[PDB]
A and B are shown apart, each in its own frame.
With several copies, the nearest count.
Chain A
């Protein structure tokens, strides 16, 4: 495909689609030859934009449990892993999830009464 076309294709690909991609090139060409695309692909400004999916916990509902329960069930935490971060809300309830999964997670949390925003 045209080089310009490839550039545009990469811009459309979610950072997830590009990560496994650079690691992919790494297997064949090697860390040396694949270094070119690896260093150029990373700049997908996914971090430089503060973005988009994820399940951000804007609010959650005056009680932990319900919210944390969902968190504990979605992440898997005892009594200091989803009770020192799920409050401020470190919205990173989960990462690298599709639109549907992120949508489903949001639902579960909202059911517990968690005002979640999906970036």
Chain B
């Protein structure tokens, strides 16, 4: 009851095994990667197959695990706003896509609950700091 671990990140909706990259990881902390697999790609079904959503997962007190699929939009639509497939090897030299001012406040607000900052102008920025180091032009 006192033994507990905690940590988990963005897992592609649908991918789990084999061991690499998700094997001894969260596999030597109490929980096994036998199940917990079909206990991820059986809850994250009805969304976007290409959505690396980071589900928060504790560990155990017995042997089992837990699950909570939070909320991308945020990260996605940001890569899929200036070509996610074809990107620039050296971003800052050339471009890949473009976005309007409207679609600047769009990916904004829709992540305020994770993104941190007061005033919308402070939100419109930072994402403008995250603007581009991956092709895409500001204007």
Footprint of B on A, CB under 8 Å? Answer: 72, 77-81
Contact with A along B104-122 (1 / 0, CB 8 A): 0000000000011110001
- Cα–Cα, bound, A55→B20 (Å): 47
Looking at the assembled complex, report how far the CB atom of A74 sits from the nearest CB atom of chain B, in whole angstroms. 14
Chain B contact residues (Cβ within 8 angstroms of A): what range?
under 10
B126 in complex: contacting residue of A72, A77, A79, A81, CB < 8 Å? A79
Other A-B contacts than A78-B115, A78-B118, A79-B126, 13 sampled, CB-CB below 8 A, are A72-B116, A77-B116, A77-B118, A78-B116, A78-B117, A78-B122, A79-B116, A79-B117, A80-B117, A80-B118, A80-B122, A81-B117, A81-B118
- Cα–Cα, bound, A78→B124 (Å): 13
Cβ contacts under 8 Å, B122 to chain A: 78, 80
Q: Which residue of B lies closest to A82 (CB)?
A: B116
Q: Which residue of B lies closest to A72 (CB)?
A: B116
Looking at the assembled complex, report how far the CB atom of A67 sits from the nearest CB atom of chain B, in whole angstroms. 15
Could you write out 11 A-B pairs with CB less than 8 Å apart? A78-B115, A78-B116, A78-B117, A78-B118, A79-B117, A79-B126, A80-B117, A80-B118, A80-B122, A81-B117, A81-B118
- Cα–Cα, bound, A80→B117 (Å): 7
B116, B118, B122, B126: residue with the most chain A Cβ atoms closer than 10 Å: B116
- Cα–Cα, bound, A16→B80 (Å): 53
Cβ contacts under 8 Å, B115 to chain A: 78
Q: Which residue of A lies closest to B112 (CB)?
A: A78
Q: What 8 pairs across the A-B complex have the smallest Cβ distances?
A: A78-B116, A78-B117, A79-B116, A81-B118, A79-B117, A78-B118, A80-B122, A79-B126
Looking at the assembled complex, report how far the CB atom of A63 sits from the nearest CB atom of chain B, in whole angstroms. 17
Cβ contacts under 8 Å, B118 to chain A: 77-78, 80-81
- Cα–Cα, bound, A77→B115 (Å): 10
Contact with A along B41-74 (1 / 0, CB 8 A): 0000000000000000000000000000000000
